[PDB]
Design a protein around this ligand. Structure first.
Ligand SMILES: NS(=O)(=O)c1ccc(NC(=O)CN2CCN(C(c3ccccc3)c3ccccc3)CC2)cc1
Ligand SMILES: [Zn+2]
Length: 260
């Protein structure tokens, strides 16, 4: 926490993380490259169930590595279930990873293809009581990943783009209520799924990854605003918050299953 020094620079980036977080070379690390020809269709997978109609956002925060739109998860609202999941998972926050250029930015790749960005909607398994206890369990979290490509703008993302001006640097936060995450979902819920981990330190292996096949389109201007954010705090040398993505990690002993 208070003494972490990892980041995405040349001296503290992904290839350095293993020194302070040995699990970086673990057996179920994320992200991974999704080889579409080797992912096997699994007819037993159930349709994914995303129920965000009662989601209630609270705030948006620049934490030095990305910006998180946080939700009030004190009640049974905004749940992800079905798909490969057993039980119900509650939405706590979402954030993105993006590049310095449209040609890169996503964490997961598809047949080695890198998207301009990737949205992560983070949920914790309610059987563990809260997020803190859930991250210590192999099936503690379910993260819904959605790729972003540059093209037509995503109307639903604009409130996010506009508030970024108020949280330019590390540690800044701004009230951000009534933001509807359903505005960030593609039409189809077809997905790939596999067991993995948090993609940033502590890199805990507590995530069931659900990655949607259909990317959403955002405009060049929308992602350009993401790139104006800073990794640094106010009054420190300006380092643009870009390329805050971890590269694909060894699949090792895992199978990626397709819902289609
Ligand atoms: N991109 S991703 O894979 O979608 C991703 C999503 C959420 C996260 N969230 C976190 O990393 C939040 N931290 C909060 C602090 N946690 C610590 C901790 C908790 C309480 C007090 C002090 C530290 C933690 C470390 C080790 C075990 C359990 C908790 C680790 C998880 C990271 C990556
Ligand atoms: Zn993430």
């Amino acid at each position: 926490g208070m003494s972490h020094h990892w980041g995405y620079g040349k001296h503290n980036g992904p290839e350095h993380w293993h020194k302070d977080f040995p699990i970086a070379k673990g057996e179920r690390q994320s992200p991974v490259d999704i080889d579409t020809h080797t992912a096997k269709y699994d007819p037993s997978l159930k349709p994914l169930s995303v129920s965000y109609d009662q989601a209630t956002s609270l705030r948006i925060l620049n934490n030095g590595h990305a910006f998180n739109v946080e939700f009030d998860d004190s009640q049974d609202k905004a749940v992800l279930k079905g798909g490969p999941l057993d039980g119900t998972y509650r939405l706590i926050q979402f954030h993105f990873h993006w590049g310095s250029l449209d040609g890169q930015g996503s964490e997961h790749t598809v047949d080695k293809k890198k998207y301009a960005a990737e949205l992560h909607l983070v949920h914790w398994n309610t059987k563990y009581g809260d997020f803190g206890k859930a991250v210590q369990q192999p099936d503690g979290l379910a993260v819904l990943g959605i790729f972003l490509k540059v093209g037509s703008a995503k109307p639903g993302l604009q409130k996010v783009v506009d508030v970024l001006d108020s949280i330019k640097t590390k540690g800044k936060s701004a009230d951000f209520t009534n933001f509807d995450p359903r505005g960030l979902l593609p039409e189809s819920l077809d997905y790939w799924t596999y067991p993995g981990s948090l993609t940033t330190p502590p890199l805990l292996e507590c995530v069931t990854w659900i990655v949607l096949k259909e990317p959403i389109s955002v405009s060049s201007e929308q992602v350009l605003k993401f790139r104006k954010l800073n990794f640094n705090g106010e009054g420190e040398p300006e380092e643009l918050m870009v390329d805050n993505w971890r590269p694909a990690q060894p699949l090792k002993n895992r199978q990626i299953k397709a819902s289609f």
